Amino acid sequence: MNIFEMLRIDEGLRLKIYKDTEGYYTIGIGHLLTKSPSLNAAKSELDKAIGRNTNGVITKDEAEKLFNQDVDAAVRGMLRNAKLKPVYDSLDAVRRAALINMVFQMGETGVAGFTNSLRMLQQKRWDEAAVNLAKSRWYNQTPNRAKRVITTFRTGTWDAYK
Ligand SMILES: [Cl-]
Ligand SMILES: [Cl-]
Protein backbone atom coordinates (compact mmCIF):
# COMPACT_ATOMS: atom_id res chain seq x y z
CA MET A 1 0.00 0.00 0.00
CA ASN A 2 1.17 3.45 -0.57
CA ILE A 3 0.20 7.06 -0.62
CA PHE A 4 -1.53 7.00 -3.92
CA GLU A 5 -3.68 4.10 -2.89
CA MET A 6 -4.18 5.42 0.46
CA LEU A 7 -5.37 8.73 -0.92
CA ARG A 8 -7.34 7.06 -3.68
CA ILE A 9 -9.27 5.32 -0.86
CA ASP A 10 -10.02 8.42 1.27
CA GLU A 11 -10.80 10.71 -1.63
CA GLY A 12 -12.52 8.46 -4.12
CA LEU A 13 -12.56 9.14 -7.79
CA ARG A 14 -15.12 11.27 -9.58
CA LEU A 15 -15.18 12.10 -13.18
CA LYS A 16 -17.70 14.90 -12.97
CA ILE A 17 -17.34 18.09 -11.03
CA TYR A 18 -18.70 17.65 -7.49
CA LYS A 19 -18.82 19.38 -4.15
CA ASP A 20 -16.56 18.20 -1.45
CA THR A 21 -17.56 17.45 2.13
CA GLU A 22 -17.12 21.20 2.63
CA GLY A 23 -19.24 22.07 -0.45
CA TYR A 24 -16.36 23.10 -2.66
CA TYR A 25 -16.14 22.25 -6.30
CA THR A 26 -13.82 19.32 -6.65
CA ILE A 27 -13.09 16.77 -9.30
CA GLY A 28 -11.05 13.59 -9.80
CA ILE A 29 -9.22 12.27 -6.73
CA GLY A 30 -9.95 15.07 -4.40
CA HIS A 31 -8.71 17.75 -6.67
CA LEU A 32 -10.12 20.97 -5.36
CA LEU A 33 -11.08 23.26 -8.11
CA THR A 34 -12.39 26.28 -6.37
CA LYS A 35 -13.69 27.68 -3.14
CA SER A 36 -16.09 29.68 -5.25
CA PRO A 37 -19.75 29.23 -5.21
CA SER A 38 -19.75 29.49 -8.96
CA LEU A 39 -19.90 26.43 -11.08
CA ASN A 40 -18.75 28.56 -14.00
CA ALA A 41 -15.74 29.50 -12.09
CA ALA A 42 -15.17 25.78 -11.43
CA LYS A 43 -15.74 24.90 -15.07
CA SER A 44 -13.19 27.47 -15.95
CA GLU A 45 -10.56 26.41 -13.40
CA LEU A 46 -11.27 22.94 -14.67
CA ASP A 47 -10.49 23.76 -18.31
CA LYS A 48 -7.46 25.67 -17.35
CA ALA A 49 -6.25 22.62 -15.35
CA ILE A 50 -6.86 20.19 -18.20
CA GLY A 51 -5.90 22.32 -21.04
CA ARG A 52 -9.11 21.63 -22.80
CA ASN A 53 -12.68 22.52 -22.96
CA THR A 54 -14.04 19.89 -20.69
CA ASN A 55 -17.61 20.69 -19.97
CA GLY A 56 -17.25 19.53 -16.24
CA VAL A 57 -16.19 16.05 -17.12
CA ILE A 58 -12.76 14.48 -17.44
CA THR A 59 -11.34 11.10 -18.29
CA LYS A 60 -9.75 8.89 -15.73
CA ASP A 61 -6.37 9.43 -17.16
CA GLU A 62 -6.90 13.11 -16.77
CA ALA A 63 -7.94 12.56 -13.22
CA GLU A 64 -4.89 10.53 -12.57
CA LYS A 65 -2.76 13.04 -14.02
CA LEU A 66 -4.10 15.78 -11.76
CA PHE A 67 -3.71 13.34 -8.90
CA ASN A 68 -0.01 12.83 -9.58
CA GLN A 69 0.53 16.45 -9.78
CA ASP A 70 -1.24 17.02 -6.56
CA VAL A 71 0.66 14.37 -4.67
CA ASP A 72 3.93 15.68 -5.98
CA ALA A 73 3.03 19.23 -5.08
CA ALA A 74 1.96 18.21 -1.58
CA VAL A 75 5.22 16.49 -0.87
CA ARG A 76 7.24 19.22 -2.28
CA GLY A 77 5.25 21.74 -0.23
CA MET A 78 5.81 19.79 2.93
CA LEU A 79 9.48 19.71 2.25
CA ARG A 80 9.63 23.42 1.89
CA ASN A 81 7.72 23.91 5.09
CA ALA A 82 9.83 24.69 8.09
CA LYS A 83 7.28 23.40 10.54
CA LEU A 84 6.59 20.40 8.42
CA LYS A 85 9.89 19.23 7.15
CA PRO A 86 11.39 18.24 10.37
CA VAL A 87 8.46 16.24 11.47
CA TYR A 88 8.31 14.53 8.19
CA ASP A 89 11.97 13.66 8.27
CA SER A 90 11.65 12.21 11.69
CA LEU A 91 8.98 9.83 10.55
CA ASP A 92 8.98 6.31 9.21
CA ALA A 93 7.62 5.55 5.86
CA VAL A 94 4.09 4.66 6.89
CA ARG A 95 3.58 7.58 9.06
CA ARG A 96 5.03 9.88 6.48
CA ALA A 97 2.20 8.76 4.34
CA ALA A 98 -0.29 9.73 7.12
CA LEU A 99 1.16 13.22 7.15
CA ILE A 100 1.04 13.69 3.46
CA ASN A 101 -2.60 12.49 3.61
CA MET A 102 -3.40 15.21 6.00
CA VAL A 103 -1.50 17.77 4.09
CA PHE A 104 -3.38 16.88 0.89
CA GLN A 105 -6.69 17.15 2.66
CA MET A 106 -6.02 20.19 4.55
CA GLY A 107 -3.26 22.19 3.18
CA GLU A 108 0.17 22.67 4.61
CA THR A 109 -0.92 25.60 6.44
CA GLY A 110 -3.85 23.74 7.81
CA VAL A 111 -1.54 21.02 9.02
CA ALA A 112 1.35 23.25 10.19
CA GLY A 113 -1.24 24.51 12.80
CA PHE A 114 -1.41 21.20 14.69
CA THR A 115 1.62 22.31 16.58
CA ASN A 116 1.12 20.15 19.60
CA SER A 117 0.36 17.01 17.72
CA LEU A 118 3.28 17.73 15.37
CA ARG A 119 5.54 17.96 18.26
CA MET A 120 4.30 14.81 19.86
CA LEU A 121 4.71 12.99 16.62
CA GLN A 122 8.25 14.20 16.56
CA GLN A 123 8.81 12.84 19.97
CA LYS A 124 7.26 9.54 18.77
CA ARG A 125 4.58 9.81 21.45
CA TRP A 126 1.99 7.97 19.35
CA ASP A 127 -0.91 7.45 21.78
CA GLU A 128 -0.55 11.04 22.94
CA ALA A 129 -0.60 12.43 19.53
CA ALA A 130 -3.61 10.35 18.53
CA VAL A 131 -5.56 11.75 21.38
CA ASN A 132 -4.33 15.25 20.56
CA LEU A 133 -5.01 14.86 16.95
CA ALA A 134 -8.59 13.90 17.78
CA LYS A 135 -9.36 17.19 19.49
CA SER A 136 -9.93 18.90 16.25
CA ARG A 137 -12.34 20.22 13.92
CA TRP A 138 -10.93 17.95 11.27
CA TYR A 139 -11.72 14.86 13.34
CA ASN A 140 -15.23 16.12 14.16
CA GLN A 141 -15.96 16.90 10.47
CA THR A 142 -14.55 13.76 8.90
CA PRO A 143 -14.32 11.34 11.73
CA ASN A 144 -13.77 8.17 9.68
CA ARG A 145 -11.13 9.48 7.43
CA ALA A 146 -9.61 11.15 10.49
CA LYS A 147 -9.68 7.87 12.41
CA ARG A 148 -7.92 6.12 9.63
CA VAL A 149 -5.06 8.54 9.57
CA ILE A 150 -4.89 8.61 13.41
CA THR A 151 -4.59 4.83 13.58
CA THR A 152 -1.83 4.94 11.05
CA PHE A 153 0.09 7.48 13.06
CA ARG A 154 -0.54 5.53 16.25
CA THR A 155 0.32 2.15 14.89
CA GLY A 156 2.86 2.79 12.11
CA THR A 157 0.79 0.22 10.07
CA TRP A 158 -1.66 0.14 7.16
CA ASP A 159 -4.15 -1.78 9.27
CA ALA A 160 -6.83 0.94 9.06
CA TYR A 161 -6.55 0.70 5.37
CA LYS A 162 -7.15 -3.07 5.15
CL1 LIG B 1 -3.71 22.39 -11.63
CL1 LIG C 1 -15.20 10.78 7.25
Swiss-Prot record:
Any Gene Ontology CC annotation: host cell cytoplasm
Chief place where the protein resides: host cell
The UniProt record lists the keyword Metal-binding: no
pH-dependence of activity, as noted: Optimum pH is 7.3.
Effect on the protein upon substituting residue 117 to I: 500-fold decrease in enzymatic activity
Effect on the protein upon substituting residue 30 to F: Almost complete loss of enzymatic activity. The enzyme is destabilized by 1.5 kcal/mol
Catalytic activities: Hydrolysis of (1->4)-beta-linkages between N-acetylmuramic acid and N-acetyl-D-glucosamine residues in a peptidoglycan and between N-acetyl-D-glucosamine residues in chitodextrins
Active-site feature positions: 11 (proton donor/acceptor), 20 (proton donor/acceptor)
Induction context: Expressed late in the viral replication.
Localization in the cell: Host cytoplasm
Binding site for substrate: 32, 104, 117, 132
Effect in UniProt of substituting residue 117 to F: 10-fold decrease in enzymatic activity
Record has Zinc as a keyword: no
Phenotype for residue 11 to A/F/H/M/N: Complete loss of enzymatic activity
Impact after mutating residue 132 to M/F: 2-fold decrease in enzymatic activity
UniProtKB keywords: Antimicrobial, Bacteriolytic enzyme, Cytolysis, Glycosidase, Host cell lysis by virus, Host cytoplasm, Hydrolase, Viral release from host cell
Listed GO biological process terms: cell wall macromolecule catabolic process; defense response to bacterium; peptidoglycan catabolic process; viral release from host cell by cytolysis
EC number: 3.2.1.17
GO molecular function, one term: lysozyme activity
Matching PANTHER family: T4-TYPE LYSOZYME 1-RELATED (PTHR37406:SF1)
Family label: Belongs to the glycosyl hydrolase 24 family.
Task performed by this protein: Endolysin with lysozyme activity that degrades host peptidoglycans and participates with the holin and spanin proteins in the sequential events which lead to the programmed host cell lysis releasing the mature viral particles. Once the holin has permeabilized the host cell membrane, the endolysin can reach the periplasm and break down the peptidoglycan layer.
Designated name of the protein: Endolysin
